[PDB]
Short mmCIF file of N, CA, C and O (backbone and C1' of nucleotides) in Angstrom, two decimals:
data_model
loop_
_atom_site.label_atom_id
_atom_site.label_comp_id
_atom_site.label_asym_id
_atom_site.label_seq_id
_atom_site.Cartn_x
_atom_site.Cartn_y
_atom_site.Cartn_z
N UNK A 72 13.21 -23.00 -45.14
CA UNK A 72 13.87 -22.08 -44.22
C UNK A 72 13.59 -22.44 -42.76
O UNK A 72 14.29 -22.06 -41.83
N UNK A 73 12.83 -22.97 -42.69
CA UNK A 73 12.39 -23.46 -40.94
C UNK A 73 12.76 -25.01 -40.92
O UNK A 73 12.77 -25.53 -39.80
N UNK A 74 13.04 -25.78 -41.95
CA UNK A 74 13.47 -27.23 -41.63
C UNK A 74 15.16 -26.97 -41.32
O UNK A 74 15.56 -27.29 -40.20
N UNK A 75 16.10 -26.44 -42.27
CA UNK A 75 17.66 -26.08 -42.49
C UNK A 75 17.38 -24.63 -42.12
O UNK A 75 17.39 -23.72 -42.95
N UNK A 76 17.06 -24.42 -40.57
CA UNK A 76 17.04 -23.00 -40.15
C UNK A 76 18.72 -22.43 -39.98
O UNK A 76 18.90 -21.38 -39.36
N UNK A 77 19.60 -22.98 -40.41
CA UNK A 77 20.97 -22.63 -40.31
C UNK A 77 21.61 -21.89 -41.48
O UNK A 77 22.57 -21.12 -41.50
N UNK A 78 20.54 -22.46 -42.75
CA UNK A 78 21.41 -21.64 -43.85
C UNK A 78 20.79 -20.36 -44.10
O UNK A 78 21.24 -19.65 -45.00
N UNK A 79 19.00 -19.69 -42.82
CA UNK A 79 18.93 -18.74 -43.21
C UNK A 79 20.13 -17.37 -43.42
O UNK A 79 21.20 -17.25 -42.82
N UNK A 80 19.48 -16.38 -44.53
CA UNK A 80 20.25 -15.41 -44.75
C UNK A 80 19.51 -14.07 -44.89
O UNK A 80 19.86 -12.90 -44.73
N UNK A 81 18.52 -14.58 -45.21
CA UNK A 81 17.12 -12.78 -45.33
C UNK A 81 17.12 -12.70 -44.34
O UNK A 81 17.34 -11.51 -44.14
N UNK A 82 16.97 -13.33 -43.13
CA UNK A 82 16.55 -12.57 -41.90
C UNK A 82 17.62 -12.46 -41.33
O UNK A 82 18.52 -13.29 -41.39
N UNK A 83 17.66 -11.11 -40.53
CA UNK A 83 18.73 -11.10 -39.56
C UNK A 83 18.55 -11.93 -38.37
O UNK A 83 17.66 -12.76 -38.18
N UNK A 84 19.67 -11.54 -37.44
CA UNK A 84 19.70 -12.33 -36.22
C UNK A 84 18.76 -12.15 -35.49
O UNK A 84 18.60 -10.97 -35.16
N UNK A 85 17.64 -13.26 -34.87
CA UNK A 85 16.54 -12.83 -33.56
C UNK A 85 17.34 -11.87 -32.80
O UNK A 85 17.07 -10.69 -33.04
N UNK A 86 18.20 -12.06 -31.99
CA UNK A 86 18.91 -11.50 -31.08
C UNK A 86 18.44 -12.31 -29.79
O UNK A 86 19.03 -12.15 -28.72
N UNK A 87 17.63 -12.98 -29.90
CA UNK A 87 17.52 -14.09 -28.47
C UNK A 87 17.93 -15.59 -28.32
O UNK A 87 17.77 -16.30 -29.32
N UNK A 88 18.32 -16.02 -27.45
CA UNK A 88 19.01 -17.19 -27.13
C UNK A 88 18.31 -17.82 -25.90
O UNK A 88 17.28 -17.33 -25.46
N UNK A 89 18.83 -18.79 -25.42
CA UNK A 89 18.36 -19.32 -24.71
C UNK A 89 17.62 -18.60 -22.92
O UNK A 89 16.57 -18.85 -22.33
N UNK A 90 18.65 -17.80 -22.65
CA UNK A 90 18.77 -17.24 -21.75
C UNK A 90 17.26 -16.07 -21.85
O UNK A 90 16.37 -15.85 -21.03
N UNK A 91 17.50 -15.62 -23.02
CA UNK A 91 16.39 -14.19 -23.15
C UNK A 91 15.03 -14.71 -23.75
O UNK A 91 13.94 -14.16 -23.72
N UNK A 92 15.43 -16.09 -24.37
CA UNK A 92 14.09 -16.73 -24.16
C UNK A 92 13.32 -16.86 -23.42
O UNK A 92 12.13 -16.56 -23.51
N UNK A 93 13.93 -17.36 -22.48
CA UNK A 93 13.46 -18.04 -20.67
C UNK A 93 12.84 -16.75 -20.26
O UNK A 93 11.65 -16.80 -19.96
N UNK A 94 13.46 -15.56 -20.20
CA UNK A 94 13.18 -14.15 -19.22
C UNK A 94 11.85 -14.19 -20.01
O UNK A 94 10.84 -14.19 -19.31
N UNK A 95 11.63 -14.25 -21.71
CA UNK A 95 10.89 -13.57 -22.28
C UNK A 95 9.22 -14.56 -21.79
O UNK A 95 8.09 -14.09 -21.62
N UNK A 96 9.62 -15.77 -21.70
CA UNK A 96 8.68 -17.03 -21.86
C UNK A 96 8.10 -16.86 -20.28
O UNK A 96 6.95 -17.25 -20.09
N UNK A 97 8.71 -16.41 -19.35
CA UNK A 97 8.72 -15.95 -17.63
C UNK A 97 7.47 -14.74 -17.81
O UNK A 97 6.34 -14.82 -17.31
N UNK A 98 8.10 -13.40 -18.82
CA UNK A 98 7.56 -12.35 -18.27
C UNK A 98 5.89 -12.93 -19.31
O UNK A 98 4.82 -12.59 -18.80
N UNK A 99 5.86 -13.36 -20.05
CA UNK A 99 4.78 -13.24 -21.11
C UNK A 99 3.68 -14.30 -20.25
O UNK A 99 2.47 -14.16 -20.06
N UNK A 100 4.50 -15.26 -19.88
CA UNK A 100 3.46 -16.64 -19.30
C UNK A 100 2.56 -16.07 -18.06
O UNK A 100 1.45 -16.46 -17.72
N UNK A 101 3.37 -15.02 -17.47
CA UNK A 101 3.39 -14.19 -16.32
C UNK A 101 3.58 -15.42 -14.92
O UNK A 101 3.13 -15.23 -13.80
N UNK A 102 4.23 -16.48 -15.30
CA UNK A 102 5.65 -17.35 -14.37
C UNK A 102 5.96 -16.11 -12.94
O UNK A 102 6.51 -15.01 -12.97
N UNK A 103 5.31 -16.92 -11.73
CA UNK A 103 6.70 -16.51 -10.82
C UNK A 103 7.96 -16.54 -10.85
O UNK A 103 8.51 -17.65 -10.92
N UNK A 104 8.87 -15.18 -10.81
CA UNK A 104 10.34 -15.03 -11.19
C UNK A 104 10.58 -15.89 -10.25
O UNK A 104 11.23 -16.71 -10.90
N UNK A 105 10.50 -16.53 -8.63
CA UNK A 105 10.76 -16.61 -8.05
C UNK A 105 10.73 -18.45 -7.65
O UNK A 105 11.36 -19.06 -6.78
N UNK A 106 9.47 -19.09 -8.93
CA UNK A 106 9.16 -20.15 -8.57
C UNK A 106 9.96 -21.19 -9.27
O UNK A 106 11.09 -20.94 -9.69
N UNK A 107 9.30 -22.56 -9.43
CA UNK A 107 10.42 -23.74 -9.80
C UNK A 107 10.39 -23.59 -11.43
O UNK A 107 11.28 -23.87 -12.23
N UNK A 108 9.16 -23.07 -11.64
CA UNK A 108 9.42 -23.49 -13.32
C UNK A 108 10.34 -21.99 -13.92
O UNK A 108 11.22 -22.36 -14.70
N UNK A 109 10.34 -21.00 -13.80
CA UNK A 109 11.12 -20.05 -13.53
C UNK A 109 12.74 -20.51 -13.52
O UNK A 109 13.53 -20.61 -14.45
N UNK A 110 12.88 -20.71 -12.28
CA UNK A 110 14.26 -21.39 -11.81
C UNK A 110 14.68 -22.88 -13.32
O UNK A 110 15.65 -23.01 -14.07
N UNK A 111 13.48 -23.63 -13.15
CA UNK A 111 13.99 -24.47 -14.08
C UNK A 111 14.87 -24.08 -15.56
O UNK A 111 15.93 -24.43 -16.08
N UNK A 112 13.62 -23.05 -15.92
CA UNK A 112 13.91 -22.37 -17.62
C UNK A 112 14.81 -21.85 -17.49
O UNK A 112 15.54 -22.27 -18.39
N UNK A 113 15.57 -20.79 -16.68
CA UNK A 113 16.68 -20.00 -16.09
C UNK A 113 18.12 -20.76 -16.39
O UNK A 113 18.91 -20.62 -17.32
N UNK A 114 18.15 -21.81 -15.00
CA UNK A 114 19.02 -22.77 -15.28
C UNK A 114 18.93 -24.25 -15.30
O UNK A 114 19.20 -25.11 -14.46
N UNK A 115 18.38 -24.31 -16.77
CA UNK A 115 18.05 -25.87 -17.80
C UNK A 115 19.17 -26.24 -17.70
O UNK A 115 19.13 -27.07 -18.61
N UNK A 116 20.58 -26.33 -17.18
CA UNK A 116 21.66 -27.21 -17.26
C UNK A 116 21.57 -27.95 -16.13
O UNK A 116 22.13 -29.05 -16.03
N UNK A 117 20.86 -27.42 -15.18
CA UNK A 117 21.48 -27.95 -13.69
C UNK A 117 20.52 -29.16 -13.39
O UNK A 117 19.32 -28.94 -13.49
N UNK A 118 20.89 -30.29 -13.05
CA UNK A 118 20.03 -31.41 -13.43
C UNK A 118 19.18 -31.63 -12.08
O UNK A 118 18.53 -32.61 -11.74
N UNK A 119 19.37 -30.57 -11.53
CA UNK A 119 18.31 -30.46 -10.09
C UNK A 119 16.96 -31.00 -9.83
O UNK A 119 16.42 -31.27 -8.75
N UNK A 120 16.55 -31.09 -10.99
CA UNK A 120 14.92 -31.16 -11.41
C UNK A 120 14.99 -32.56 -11.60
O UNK A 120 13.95 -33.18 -11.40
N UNK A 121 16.03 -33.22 -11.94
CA UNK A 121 16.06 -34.94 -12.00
C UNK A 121 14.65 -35.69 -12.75
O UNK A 121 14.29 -36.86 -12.63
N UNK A 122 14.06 -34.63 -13.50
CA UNK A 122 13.25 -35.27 -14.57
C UNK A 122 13.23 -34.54 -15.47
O UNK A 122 13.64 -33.41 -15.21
N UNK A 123 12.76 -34.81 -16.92
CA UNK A 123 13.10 -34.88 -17.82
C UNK A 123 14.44 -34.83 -18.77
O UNK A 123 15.21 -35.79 -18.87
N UNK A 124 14.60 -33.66 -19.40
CA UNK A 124 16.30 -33.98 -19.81
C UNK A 124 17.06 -32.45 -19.17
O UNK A 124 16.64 -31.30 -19.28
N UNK A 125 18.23 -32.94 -18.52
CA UNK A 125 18.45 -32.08 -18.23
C UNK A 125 19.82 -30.87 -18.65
O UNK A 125 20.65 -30.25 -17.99
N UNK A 126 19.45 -31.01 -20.12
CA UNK A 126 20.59 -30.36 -21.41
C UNK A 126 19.58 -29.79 -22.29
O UNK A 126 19.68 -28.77 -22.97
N UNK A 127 18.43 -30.72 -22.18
CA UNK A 127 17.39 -29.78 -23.60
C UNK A 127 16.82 -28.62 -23.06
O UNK A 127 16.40 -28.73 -21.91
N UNK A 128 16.68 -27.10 -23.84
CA UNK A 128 15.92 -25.97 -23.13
C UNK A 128 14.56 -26.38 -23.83
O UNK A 128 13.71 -26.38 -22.94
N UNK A 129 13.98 -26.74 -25.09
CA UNK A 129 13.39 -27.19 -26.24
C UNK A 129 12.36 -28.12 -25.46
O UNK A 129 11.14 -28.01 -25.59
N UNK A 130 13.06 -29.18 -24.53
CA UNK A 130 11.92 -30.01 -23.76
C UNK A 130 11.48 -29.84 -22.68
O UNK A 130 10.34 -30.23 -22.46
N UNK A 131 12.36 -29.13 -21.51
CA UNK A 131 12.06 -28.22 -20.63
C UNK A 131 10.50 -27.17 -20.76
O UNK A 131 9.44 -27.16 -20.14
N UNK A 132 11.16 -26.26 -22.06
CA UNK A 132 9.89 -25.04 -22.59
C UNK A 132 8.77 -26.16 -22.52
O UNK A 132 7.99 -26.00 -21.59
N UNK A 133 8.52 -27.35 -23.38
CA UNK A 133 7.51 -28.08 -23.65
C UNK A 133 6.89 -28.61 -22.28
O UNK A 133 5.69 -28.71 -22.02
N UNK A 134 7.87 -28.91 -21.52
CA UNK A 134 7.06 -29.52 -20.24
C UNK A 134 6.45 -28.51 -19.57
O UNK A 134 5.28 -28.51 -19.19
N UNK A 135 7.41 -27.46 -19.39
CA UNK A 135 6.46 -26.10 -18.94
C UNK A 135 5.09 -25.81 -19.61
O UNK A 135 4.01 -25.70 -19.02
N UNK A 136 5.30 -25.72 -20.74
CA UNK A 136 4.21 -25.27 -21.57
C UNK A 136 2.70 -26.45 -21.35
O UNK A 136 1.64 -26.04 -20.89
N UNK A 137 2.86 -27.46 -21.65
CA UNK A 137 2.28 -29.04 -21.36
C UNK A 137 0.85 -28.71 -20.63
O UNK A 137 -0.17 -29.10 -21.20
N UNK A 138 0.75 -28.08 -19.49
CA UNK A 138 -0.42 -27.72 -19.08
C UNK A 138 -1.18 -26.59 -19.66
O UNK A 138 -2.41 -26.53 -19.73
N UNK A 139 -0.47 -25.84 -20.00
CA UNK A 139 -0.94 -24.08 -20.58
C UNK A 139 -0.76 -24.09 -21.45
O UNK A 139 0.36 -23.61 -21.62
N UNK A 140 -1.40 -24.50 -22.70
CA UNK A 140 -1.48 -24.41 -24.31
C UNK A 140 -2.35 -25.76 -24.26
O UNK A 140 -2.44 -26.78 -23.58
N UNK A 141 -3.07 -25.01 -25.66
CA UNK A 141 -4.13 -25.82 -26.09
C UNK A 141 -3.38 -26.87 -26.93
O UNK A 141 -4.01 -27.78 -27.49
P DA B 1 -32.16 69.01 34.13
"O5'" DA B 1 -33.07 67.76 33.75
"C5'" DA B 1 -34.27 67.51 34.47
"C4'" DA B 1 -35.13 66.48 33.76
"C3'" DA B 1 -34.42 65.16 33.45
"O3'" DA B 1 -35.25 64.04 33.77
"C1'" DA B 1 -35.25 66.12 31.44
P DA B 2 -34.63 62.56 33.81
"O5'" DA B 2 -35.39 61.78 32.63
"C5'" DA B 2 -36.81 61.67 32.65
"C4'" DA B 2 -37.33 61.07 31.36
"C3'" DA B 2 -36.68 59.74 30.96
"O3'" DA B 2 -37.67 58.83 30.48
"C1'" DA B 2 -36.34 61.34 29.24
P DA B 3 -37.25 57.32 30.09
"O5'" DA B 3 -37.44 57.27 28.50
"C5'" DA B 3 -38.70 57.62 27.92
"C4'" DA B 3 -38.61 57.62 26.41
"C3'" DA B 3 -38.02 56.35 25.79
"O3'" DA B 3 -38.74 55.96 24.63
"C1'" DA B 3 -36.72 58.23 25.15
P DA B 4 -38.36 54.61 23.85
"O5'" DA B 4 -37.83 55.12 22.43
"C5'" DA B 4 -38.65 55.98 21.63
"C4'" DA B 4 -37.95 56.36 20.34
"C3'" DA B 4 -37.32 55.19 19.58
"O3'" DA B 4 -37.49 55.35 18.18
"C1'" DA B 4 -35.62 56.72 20.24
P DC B 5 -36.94 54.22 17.16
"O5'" DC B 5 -35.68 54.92 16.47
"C5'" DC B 5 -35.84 56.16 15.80
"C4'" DC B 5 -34.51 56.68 15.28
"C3'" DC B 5 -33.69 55.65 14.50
"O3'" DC B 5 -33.15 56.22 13.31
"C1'" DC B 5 -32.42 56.46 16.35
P DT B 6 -32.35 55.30 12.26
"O5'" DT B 6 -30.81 55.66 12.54
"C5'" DT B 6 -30.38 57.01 12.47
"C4'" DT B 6 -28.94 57.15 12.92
"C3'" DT B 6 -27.97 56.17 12.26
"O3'" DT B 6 -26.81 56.85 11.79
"C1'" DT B 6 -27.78 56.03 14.62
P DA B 7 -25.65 56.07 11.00
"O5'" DA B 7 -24.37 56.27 11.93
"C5'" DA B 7 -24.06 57.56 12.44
"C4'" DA B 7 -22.70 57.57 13.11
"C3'" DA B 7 -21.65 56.72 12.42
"O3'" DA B 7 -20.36 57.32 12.55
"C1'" DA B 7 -22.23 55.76 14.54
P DT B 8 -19.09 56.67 11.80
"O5'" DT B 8 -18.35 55.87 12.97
"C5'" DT B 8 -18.07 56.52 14.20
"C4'" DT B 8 -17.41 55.57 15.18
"C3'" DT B 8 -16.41 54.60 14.55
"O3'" DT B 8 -15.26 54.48 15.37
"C1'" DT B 8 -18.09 53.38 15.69
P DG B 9 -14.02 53.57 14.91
"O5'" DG B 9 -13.89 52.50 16.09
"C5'" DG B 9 -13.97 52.93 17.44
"C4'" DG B 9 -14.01 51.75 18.39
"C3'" DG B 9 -13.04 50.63 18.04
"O3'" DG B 9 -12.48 50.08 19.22
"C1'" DG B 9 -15.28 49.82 17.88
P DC B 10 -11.25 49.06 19.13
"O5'" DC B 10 -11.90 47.64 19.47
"C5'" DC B 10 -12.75 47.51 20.59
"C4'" DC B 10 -13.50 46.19 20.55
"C3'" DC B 10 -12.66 45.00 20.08
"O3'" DC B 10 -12.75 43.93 21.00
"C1'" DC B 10 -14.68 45.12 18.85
P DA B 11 -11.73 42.69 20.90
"O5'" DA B 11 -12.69 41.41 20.90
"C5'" DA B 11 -13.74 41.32 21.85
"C4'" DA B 11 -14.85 40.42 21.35
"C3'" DA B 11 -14.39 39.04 20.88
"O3'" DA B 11 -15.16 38.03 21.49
"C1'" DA B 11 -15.66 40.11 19.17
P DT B 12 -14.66 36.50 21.45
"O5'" DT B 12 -15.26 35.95 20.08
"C5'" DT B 12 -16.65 35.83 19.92
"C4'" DT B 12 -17.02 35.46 18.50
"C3'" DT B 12 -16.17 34.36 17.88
"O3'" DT B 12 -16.77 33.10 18.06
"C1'" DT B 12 -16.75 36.12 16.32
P DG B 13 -16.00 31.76 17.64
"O5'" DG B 13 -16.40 31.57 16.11
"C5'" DG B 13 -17.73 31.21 15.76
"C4'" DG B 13 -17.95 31.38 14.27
"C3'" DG B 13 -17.19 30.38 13.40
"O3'" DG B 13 -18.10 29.48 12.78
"C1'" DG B 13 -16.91 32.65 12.61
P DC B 14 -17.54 28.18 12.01
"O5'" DC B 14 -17.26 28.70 10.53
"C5'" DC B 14 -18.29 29.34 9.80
"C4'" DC B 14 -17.73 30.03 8.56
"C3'" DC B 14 -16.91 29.13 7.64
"O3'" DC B 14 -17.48 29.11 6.34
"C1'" DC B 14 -15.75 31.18 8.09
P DT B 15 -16.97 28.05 5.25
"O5'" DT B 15 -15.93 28.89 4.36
"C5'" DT B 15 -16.36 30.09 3.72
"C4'" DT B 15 -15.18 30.82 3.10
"C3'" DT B 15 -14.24 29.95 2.27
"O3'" DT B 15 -14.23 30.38 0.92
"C1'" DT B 15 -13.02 31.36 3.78
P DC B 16 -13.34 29.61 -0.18
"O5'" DC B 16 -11.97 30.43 -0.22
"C5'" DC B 16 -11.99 31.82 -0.50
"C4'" DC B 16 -10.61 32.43 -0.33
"C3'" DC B 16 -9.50 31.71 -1.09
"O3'" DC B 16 -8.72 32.64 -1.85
"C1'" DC B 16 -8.91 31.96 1.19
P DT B 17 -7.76 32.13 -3.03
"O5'" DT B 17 -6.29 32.36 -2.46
"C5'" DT B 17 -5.79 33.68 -2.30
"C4'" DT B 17 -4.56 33.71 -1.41
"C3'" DT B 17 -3.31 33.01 -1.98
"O3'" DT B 17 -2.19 33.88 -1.89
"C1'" DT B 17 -3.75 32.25 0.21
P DA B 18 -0.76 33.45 -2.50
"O5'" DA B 18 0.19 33.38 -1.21
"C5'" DA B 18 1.58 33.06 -1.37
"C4'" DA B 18 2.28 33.00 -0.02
"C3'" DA B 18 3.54 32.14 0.00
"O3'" DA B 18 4.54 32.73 0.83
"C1'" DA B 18 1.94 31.21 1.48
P DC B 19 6.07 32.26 0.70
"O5'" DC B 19 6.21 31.09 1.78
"C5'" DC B 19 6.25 31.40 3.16
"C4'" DC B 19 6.36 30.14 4.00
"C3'" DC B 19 7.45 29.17 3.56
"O3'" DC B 19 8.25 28.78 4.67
"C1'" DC B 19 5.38 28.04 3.73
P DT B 20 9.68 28.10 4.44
"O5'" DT B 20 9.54 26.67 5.13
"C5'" DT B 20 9.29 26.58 6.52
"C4'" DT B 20 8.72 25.22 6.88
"C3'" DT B 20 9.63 24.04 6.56
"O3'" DT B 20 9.84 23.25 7.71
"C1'" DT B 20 7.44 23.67 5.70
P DG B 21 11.04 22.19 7.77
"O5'" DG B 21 10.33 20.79 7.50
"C5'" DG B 21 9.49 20.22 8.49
"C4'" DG B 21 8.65 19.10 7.92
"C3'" DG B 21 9.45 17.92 7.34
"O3'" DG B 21 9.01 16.70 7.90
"C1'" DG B 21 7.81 18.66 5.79
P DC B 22 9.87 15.36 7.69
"O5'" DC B 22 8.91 14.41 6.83
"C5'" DC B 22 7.72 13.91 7.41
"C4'" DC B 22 6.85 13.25 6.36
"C3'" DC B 22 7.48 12.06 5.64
"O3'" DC B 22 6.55 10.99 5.54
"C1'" DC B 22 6.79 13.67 4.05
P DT B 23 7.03 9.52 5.10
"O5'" DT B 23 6.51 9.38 3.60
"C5'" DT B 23 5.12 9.47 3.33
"C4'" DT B 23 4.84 9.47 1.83
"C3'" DT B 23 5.54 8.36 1.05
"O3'" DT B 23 4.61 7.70 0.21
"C1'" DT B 23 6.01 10.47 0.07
P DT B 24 5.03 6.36 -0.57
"O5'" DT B 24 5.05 6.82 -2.10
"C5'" DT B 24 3.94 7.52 -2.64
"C4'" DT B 24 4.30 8.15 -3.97
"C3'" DT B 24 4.94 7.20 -4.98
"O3'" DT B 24 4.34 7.36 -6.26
"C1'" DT B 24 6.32 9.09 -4.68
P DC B 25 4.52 6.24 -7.39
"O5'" DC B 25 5.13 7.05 -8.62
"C5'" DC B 25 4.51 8.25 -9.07
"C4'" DC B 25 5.46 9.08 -9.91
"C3'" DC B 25 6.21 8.30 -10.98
"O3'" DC B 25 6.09 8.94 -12.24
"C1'" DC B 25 7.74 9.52 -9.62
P DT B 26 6.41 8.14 -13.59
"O5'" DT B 26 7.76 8.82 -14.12
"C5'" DT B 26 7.80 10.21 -14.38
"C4'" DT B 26 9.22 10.73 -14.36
"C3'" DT B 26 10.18 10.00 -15.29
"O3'" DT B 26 10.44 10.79 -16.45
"C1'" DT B 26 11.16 10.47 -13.13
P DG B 27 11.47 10.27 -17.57
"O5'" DG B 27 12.89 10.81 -17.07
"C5'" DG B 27 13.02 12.16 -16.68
"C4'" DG B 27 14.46 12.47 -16.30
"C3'" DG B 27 15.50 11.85 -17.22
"O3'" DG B 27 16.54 12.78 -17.50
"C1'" DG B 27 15.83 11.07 -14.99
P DA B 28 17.66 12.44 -18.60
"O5'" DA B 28 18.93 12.01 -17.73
"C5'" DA B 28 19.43 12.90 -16.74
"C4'" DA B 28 20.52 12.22 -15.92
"C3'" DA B 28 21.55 11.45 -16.75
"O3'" DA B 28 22.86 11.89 -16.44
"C1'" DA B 28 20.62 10.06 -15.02
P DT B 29 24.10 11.38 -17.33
"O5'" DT B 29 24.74 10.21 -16.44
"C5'" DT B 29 25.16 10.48 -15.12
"C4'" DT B 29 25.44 9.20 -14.36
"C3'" DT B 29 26.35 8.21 -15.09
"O3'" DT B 29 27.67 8.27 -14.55
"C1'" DT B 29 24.48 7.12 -14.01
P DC B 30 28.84 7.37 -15.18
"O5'" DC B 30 28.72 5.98 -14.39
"C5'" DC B 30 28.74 5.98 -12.97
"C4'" DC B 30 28.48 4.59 -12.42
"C3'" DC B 30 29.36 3.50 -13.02
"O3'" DC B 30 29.93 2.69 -12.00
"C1'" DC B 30 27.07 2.91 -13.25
P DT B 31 31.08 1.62 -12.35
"O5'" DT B 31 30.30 0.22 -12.32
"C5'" DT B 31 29.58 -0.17 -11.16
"C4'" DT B 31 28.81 -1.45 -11.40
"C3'" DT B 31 29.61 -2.58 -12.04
"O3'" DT B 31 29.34 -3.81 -11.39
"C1'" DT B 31 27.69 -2.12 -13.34
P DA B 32 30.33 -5.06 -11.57
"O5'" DA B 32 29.41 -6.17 -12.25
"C5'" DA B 32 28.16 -6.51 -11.66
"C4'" DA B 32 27.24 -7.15 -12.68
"C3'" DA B 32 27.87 -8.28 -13.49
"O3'" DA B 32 27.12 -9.47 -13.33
"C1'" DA B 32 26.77 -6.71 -14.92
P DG B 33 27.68 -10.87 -13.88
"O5'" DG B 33 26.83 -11.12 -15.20
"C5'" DG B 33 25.41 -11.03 -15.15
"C4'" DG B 33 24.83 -10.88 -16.54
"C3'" DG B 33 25.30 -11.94 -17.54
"O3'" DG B 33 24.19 -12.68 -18.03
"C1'" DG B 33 25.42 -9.76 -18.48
P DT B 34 24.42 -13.95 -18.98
"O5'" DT B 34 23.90 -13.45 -20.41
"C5'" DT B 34 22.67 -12.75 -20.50
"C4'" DT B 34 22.36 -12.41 -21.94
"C3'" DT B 34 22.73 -13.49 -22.95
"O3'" DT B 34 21.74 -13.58 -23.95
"C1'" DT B 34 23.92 -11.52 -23.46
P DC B 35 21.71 -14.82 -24.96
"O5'" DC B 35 22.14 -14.18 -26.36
"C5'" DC B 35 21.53 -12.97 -26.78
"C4'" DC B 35 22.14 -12.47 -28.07
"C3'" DC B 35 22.62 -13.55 -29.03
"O3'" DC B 35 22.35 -13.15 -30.36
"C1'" DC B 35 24.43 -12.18 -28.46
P DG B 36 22.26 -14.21 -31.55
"O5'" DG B 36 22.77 -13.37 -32.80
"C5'" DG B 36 23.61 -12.25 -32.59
"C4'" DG B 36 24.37 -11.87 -33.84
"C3'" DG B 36 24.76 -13.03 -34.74
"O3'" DG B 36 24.87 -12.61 -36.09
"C1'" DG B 36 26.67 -12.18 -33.57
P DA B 37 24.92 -13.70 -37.27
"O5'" DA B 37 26.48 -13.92 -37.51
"C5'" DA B 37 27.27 -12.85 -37.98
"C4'" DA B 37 28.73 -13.06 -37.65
"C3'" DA B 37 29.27 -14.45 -37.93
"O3'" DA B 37 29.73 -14.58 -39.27
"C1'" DA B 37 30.19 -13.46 -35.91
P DC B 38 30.61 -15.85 -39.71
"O5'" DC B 38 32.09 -15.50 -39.21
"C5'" DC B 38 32.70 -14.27 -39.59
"C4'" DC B 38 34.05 -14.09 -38.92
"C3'" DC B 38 34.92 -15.33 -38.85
"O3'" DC B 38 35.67 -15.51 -40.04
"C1'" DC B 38 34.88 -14.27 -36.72
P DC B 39 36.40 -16.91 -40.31
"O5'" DC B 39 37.46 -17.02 -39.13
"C5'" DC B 39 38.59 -16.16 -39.09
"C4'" DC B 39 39.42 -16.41 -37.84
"C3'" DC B 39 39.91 -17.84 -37.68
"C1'" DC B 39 38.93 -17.07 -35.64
#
DNA sequence: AAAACTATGCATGCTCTACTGCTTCTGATCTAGTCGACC
């Protein structure tokens, strides 16, 4: 169920996506709303940041994360 | 006729109880955006 997470069916929908991830990963990390990594997770499309990838939210979270997790 | 004791009025401070104005908290409303799933 977590390798072919597409054919789950017991669980309902998270109800979060990319977007309410980011807010959620902001308010929990306790992230300045206001700062770059903030802005980055927010809007992961905009290739502003000119490093790493700038389409993945998945490697973004990780680079954020990279210093703060064991 | 002179001196001592007492009554009543008034000043004085402190303490306690309503009323007005400023600041903050909550509720209610509206507007904007996200997500599930279909096609």
């Amino acid at each position: 169920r977590l390798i072919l997470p597409q054919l789950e069916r017991e669980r309902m929908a998270y109800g979060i996506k990319e977007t309410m991830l980011a807010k959620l990963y902001i308010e929990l990390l306790n992230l300045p709303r206001d700062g770059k990594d903030a802005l980055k997770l927010l809007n992961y499309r905009t290739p502003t940041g000119t490093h790493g990838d700038a389409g993945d939210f998945a490697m973004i979270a990780y680079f954020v994360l990279k210093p703060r997790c064991l």
